[PDB]
Amino acid sequence: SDLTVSLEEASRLESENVKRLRQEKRLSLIVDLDQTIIHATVDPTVGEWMSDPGNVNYDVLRDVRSFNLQEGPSGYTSCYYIKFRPGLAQFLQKISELYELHIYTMGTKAYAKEVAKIIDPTGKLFQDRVLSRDDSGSLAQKSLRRLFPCDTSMVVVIDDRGDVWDWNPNLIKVVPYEFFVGIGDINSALEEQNKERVTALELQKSERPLAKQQNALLEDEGKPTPSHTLLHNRDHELERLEKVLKDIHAVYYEEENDISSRSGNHKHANVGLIIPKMKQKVLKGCRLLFSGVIPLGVDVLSSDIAKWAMSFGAEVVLDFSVPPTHLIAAKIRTEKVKKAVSMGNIKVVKLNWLTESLSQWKRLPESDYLLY
Template sequence: MCMRCGKSLEEKSGVIFGYIHKTDMKNLLRYKKLYLILDLDHTLLNSTSLAHISSEEEHLRGKVDSREDISKGSLFNLEHMHTMTKLRPFVRTFLKEASEMFEMYIYTMGDRSYALEMAKLLDPKREYFHERVISRDDGTQRQQKGLDVVLGQESYVLILDDTEKAWTKHKDNLLLMERYHYFASSCQQFGFSCKSLSEMETDENEGDGAHATVIGVLKRVHTIFFSCMLPSLTELEDELAGRDVRQVLKTLRKEVLEGCKIIFSRVFPTHFPARQHQLWKMAEQLGATCTVDLDDSVTHVVATDAGTEKSRWAVKEKKSLVHPRWIEASYYFWKRQPEESFSVDQKASS
């Protein structure tokens, strides 16, 4: 069905969605389900051109999984697309558990043929997405993603993506994912000079990796949103009308660094407005208070150099001196990370 005029569309004409009428939304809410929008690349999986496989990744060619039983595999050689794709660890369990709480959509800036091929790898039995696959061919804004394509009420929608800039109008719905860089070409694309996971012949941990973390967050959001449910559908509609999943997400996020007061030391470029820096914004979203005034109420000094005046003060006053990655890790894992795991090397500056 055309999202603009309501005309029925053939499959080849583009995305096939049933317009989400109020009736459909009532049914979803009756079954305690919300909407979940999932990005593909660097969120659920990582792909590379076969031509870009490095010499240290050649071992992968002999480790690809058979497509006879896709549901058991995670590394696929798609020769017809000249592509190799690696599914992120825990993704199958993640999709299974998320499907019990959400109606899920794939939304990618890749083209439609690629999106459908990835959907086959992730959902070979068509249990989770059905026709709910959105590609750049279906978007209404160039280089931007929008919930106008999904047609669901924003207060009932969560988004999982590795790129905040793609959702400038819907940041409050977004759970930002740490990017999954399995292949060397992916690292190079984002300017990293380090070896990729595949080159090191390792991978994210199934038990406490990105998807294992975020499914826990989704469960908490879902539980809070549907708490104190009322028995009748009419009462349910009235009760849920005032609820907003974005507020639930915001509240949970602010619990992560609640009670922390942070000052930064030589982390931002000279003359850069501190309050506009991503780290400052992240810390505040996590519930921390950020300041430019050094006093006894400060609990954390964030720095990369232990030799700065503020860093030395932190050591002297027995305050936490942590690397900026402490904030990032706490943000992605939705949990305050151990400060000792992100200490600033004092020997290098002595």
């Protein structure tokens, strides 16, 4: 019936796209919004600072855009302030040459459209390839299957959160973009989620966290103005992401093009295999033991930090049975720390050593994070 034929049609269409992409010599890139390529806030403090050229935060707010949104319930309206990550225009422009772009956000569709309107005014970058929490199919997680149910060999994902992707092998976790300091992700059981959301938005509009932190910084008599200014433009993560993305593409089409041995629907490259290969080298050789990092209520080997570290080739042990190379500790003289210190061959470092190493795709010198 109109289902057997339909499913066969959808399947043909899916393989068509995979073929189309390889003929354009491109891949698919799933792009997250919040804290990946933008940062948003409803803290009215932004509008106030933007209206005062003499304000210490004025200069870094010159490129900030805003828009209004009223949604679902009883027309709750909010003025959103959007800060685009440095170099975004060029990143999208350049990356579009190697990847077909898709947006996949946990924000609402209305939210996504407004953001898309600004970053993609001609609609050529993303077209209609935009997924929001209104049509993704989940309020807690993202799935490659929502976009590529049968073949994910050509899809790369860039997102600041690895948990919403189950630390999928196709994921390139990005350093969270936190321009509006102290503000996290304004977008994080539908009506039950909307409630707490509208609550976080209100708490932000009334508590003015930005003003609160800026005031605190100024209330500390000093001379170095810069260190007293809350907002700063010191992020060029996109230039780094561009490099990694160019490499993945290059490696994929190198393996792909050299699949010369009946290139029909025989065998092709797989970003899902290529990416892990690239990351596995970073912390290969490291055996990590955590102390005061993972809550006892949470499982260690399934914790986000552990999975993040393992995606980069590190091993995560639970005890000293097999002496770990590093003890990731949370500034607390625990029995694990004492133990490792007595062994003298274990590097006792702060969590930062690991998160910064993972963020830089490079095993950093323990010396700067060493506790023992």
